[PDB]
Symmetry: D2
Subunit: 115 residues, 4 copies
Amino acid sequence: CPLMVKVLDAVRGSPAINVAVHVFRKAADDTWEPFASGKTSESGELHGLTTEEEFVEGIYKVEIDTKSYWKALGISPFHEHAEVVFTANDSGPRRYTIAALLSPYSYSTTAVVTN
Amino acid sequence: CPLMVKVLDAVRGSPAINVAVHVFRKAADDTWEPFASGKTSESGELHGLTTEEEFVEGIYKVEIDTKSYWKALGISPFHEHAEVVFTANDSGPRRYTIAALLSPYSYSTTAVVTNP
Amino acid sequence: CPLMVKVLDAVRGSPAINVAVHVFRKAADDTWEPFASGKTSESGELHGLTTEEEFVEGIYKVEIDTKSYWKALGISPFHEHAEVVFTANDSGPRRYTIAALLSPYSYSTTAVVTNP
Amino acid sequence: CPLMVKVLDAVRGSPAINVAVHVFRKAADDTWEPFASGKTSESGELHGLTTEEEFVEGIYKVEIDTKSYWKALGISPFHEHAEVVFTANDSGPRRYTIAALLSPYSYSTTAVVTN
Ligand SMILES: O=C(O)CO/N=C(/c1ccccc1)c1ccc(Cl)c(Cl)c1
Ligand SMILES: O=C(O)CO/N=C(\c1ccccc1)c1ccc(Cl)c(Cl)c1
């Protein structure tokens, strides 16, 4: 699995469950084409988005539906969503984990790239 | 000043200076229209982007060009840019500070919203 | 002002007001001695803790009483407090801003260090 | 395993490996008594610190030796260490994960409490 997403909730100190996640790849058209999508699991994780074959070098966007998550909790959030845009590179390590820590008025994101 | 951007560098412990920022507003046809742009100062701040009259309700996107920033320091970073998307002035006018704390493989963004 | 503390609330998108802050300096016997203390203002800032003369080289600890803060908002948080420990003025005097961004189960702290 | 620590490096986008971690429990003496310690693994994780029997309600301090980590990388860091102080509570969920994301002049920490 070369791309995994992990979403955490900083208010409840828990994994962010059932969060919609959409992945896009930039096309020569210069527009974002849908690539993969999922809802996070009970552990806040989303796996099996793509394969090694499919995940070629390019610019990818990971879009996390944070607003719907906070709305579900009855908490008024600042952001429409959290979007992480990055370039996938062959020179780098094989596996990418995109992590997001969510708060109603803030988020943090990090990438953990490993072999 | 209803919209201010502050960018900090978590590697150097400093303001992130001369960072390009672009602000977009969602149009009637759903396209992102250019709204305002600038560079952060020596204090990592960008002020004077808009006015109270111009800054109407809407969905706005603040794009911070972090990749150029890191590249000028010799660092090849993970992210193309940091993007902050939010609905503004939904419940009347407010003043917004969008802050970003940058590292090569990570970034944090928070909003401070105050009532005029 | 060589040492300033800024505290923000990531739930409300606001300054974190009236937060108690205690600053300690490591003594000759390795004990933490009280150095300065105060509460954040309506802007989430605490200034006037020390002077250039008083703020000598040393290891300092900035303790932010986040648990009292959250409890007054009805929230039972994870952390007792946020503690920031650092060596200051090691290479000559500097101005330090210690910033903390608070959530009930998480906190982020960054330093902005500038040369007088 | 009721207490795990996970340490990530925001500069290299990788797990923070071989980082010293010390856990303390507050004593009636009002002083920190050593409880457990370890070095993070190649995945940035430290497990098997304690048992369910041993990990009673109380105030605990997790102290991460961030300065030595950055020194090893030749990067000048701001903090002496990262310390996370919290109260363990029976009413809450059984498992605690203390995570830290490190930068030379900043860190973030979060707790993920689950059953
Ligand atoms: O709205 C604001 O005031 C700007 O936000 N500022 C800061 C900050 C502020 C001053 C000094 C250092 C960081 C900030 C932002 C983000 C984070 Cl994650 C942290 Cl620990 C601090
Ligand atoms: O595990 C991974 O590969 C990615 O995890 N990243 C985590 C994290 C990890 C475990 C538990 C809690 C947070 C994370 C992310 C962002 C932040 Cl700001 C923090 Cl303090 C932790």
